[PDB]
């Protein structure tokens, strides 16, 4: 893996390190999360992956806060944002150092074929997946749905489900998960105060084919359970970050 070019400028976040293919930021100031509302952190971070790769953006904290896991498309030249939700019904604070923000690359593949939709732009990582039925997501509840018809099989890659940013901004998070052979149960949580009605055929998540190297059972400084959970640890590509300040917009 050749360089991930990046720029970073944000005096409210510290660059902890950019090592072994993962860049980590930490919060220098308190971030307040109101209950029932989305909190977005504008990272002041811009990045471009090398050929054949996307980027994965995620947050880690021991506080009662859930972060959207973001799939960053290779053509994306805008600012990266971290989308957070409050698990509690009262204000939750992330004191300095309590939030870690990680960025790292992965190889992905794309099939040519709803319910699974082609990438919307050249090189987009995820294929949107359509809802098979109408769902009513009441506030602070989780609703699950099963996808049973197999996605296309891609040698040496593994189908996985991630959320999309638009729904996350509305307070609806998808728990990322592997789509194994017998089907996948996709769980959607509504962290807002509004009942959200999602109808049949609505795009509600995306299918990503991660190269099999990026999924491991082994814990190390090269992997993290914060992406897809503790069974399927995310092991990112061994790329090098290269600072290119002109990427900042
Ligand atoms: O947590 C996220 C997810 C996505 N993006 C950027 C990069 C993506 O290419 C683009 C669109 O994301 P989606 O709507 O596909 O999730 O937004 C972020 O900044 N943060």
Q: Ligand 1, closest atom to CA 69?
A: 1
Question: How far is residue 79's CA from residue 242's CA, in Å, rounded to a whole number?
Answer: 17
Cβ count near 35 (within 10 Å): 16
Q: Report the structure determination method.
A: X-ray
**CA proximity to 136, closest of 202, 48, 82, 51:** 202
Residues paired with 106 in a beta bridge: 54
Chain centroid offset of residue 26 CA: 17
Question: How far is residue 71's CA from residue 206's CA, in Å, rounded to a whole number?
Answer: 9
CATH of 1-109+212-249, one of 2.70.40.10, 3.50.50.60, 3.40.50.300, 3.40.50.2000: 2.70.40.10
With a 6 Å cutoff on the Cβ, whether 182 touches ligand 1 is: no
Chain centroid offset of residue 32 CA: 21
Question: How far is residue 249's CA from residue 245's CA, in Å, rounded to a whole number?
Answer: 9
The answer to whether 56 touches 103, Cβ cutoff 8 Å, is yes
- Residue minimizing CA distance to atom 14 of ligand 1: 165
Distance (angstroms) between ligand 1 centre and the Cα of 230 equals 23
Domain limits, the chain: 1-109+212-249, 110-211
With a 6 Å cutoff on the Cβ, whether 102 touches ligand 1 is: no
CATH class for domain 110-211? mainly beta
**Tokens 């602070």 sit at which residue?**
140
- Residue minimizing CA distance to atom 8 of ligand 1: 72
Cβ count near 121 (within 10 Å): 10
């Amino acid at each position: 893996c050749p360089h991930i070019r990046y720029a970073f400028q944000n005096d409210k976040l510290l660059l902890q390190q950019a090592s072994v293919g993962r860049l980590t930021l930490v919060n220098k100031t308190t971030i307040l999360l109101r209950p029932m509302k989305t909190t977005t952190v504008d990272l002041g971070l811009y990045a471009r992956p090398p050929e054949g790769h996307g980027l994965m953006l995620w947050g880690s904290t021991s506080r009662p806060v859930t972060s959207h896991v973001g799939i960053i498309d290779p053509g994306y030249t805008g600012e990266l944002r971290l989308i957070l939700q409050n698990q509690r019904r009262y204000n939750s604070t992330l004191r300095p150092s309590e939030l870690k923000i990680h960025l790292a690359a992965f190889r992905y593949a794309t099939p040519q074929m709803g319910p699974i939709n082609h990438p919307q732009y050249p090189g987009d990582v995820g294929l949107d997946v359509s809802l098979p039925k109408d769902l009513a997501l009441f506030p602070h509840q989780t609703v699950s749905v099963t996808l049973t018809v197999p996605p296309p099989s891609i040698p040496h890659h593994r189908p996985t489900i991630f959320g999309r940013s638009g729904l996350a901004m509305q307070g609806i998070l998808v728990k990322p998960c592997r789509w194994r052979r017998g089907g996948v149960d996709v769980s959607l949580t509504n962290f807002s105060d509004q009942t959200v009605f999602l109808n049949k055929y609505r795009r509600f998540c995306q299918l990503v084919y991660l190269h099999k190297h990026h999924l491991t059972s082994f814990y190390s400084p090269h992997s993290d359970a914060g992406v897809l959970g503790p069974r399927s640890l995310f092991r990112w590509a061994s790329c090098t970050f290269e600072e290119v300040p002109s990427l900042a917009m």
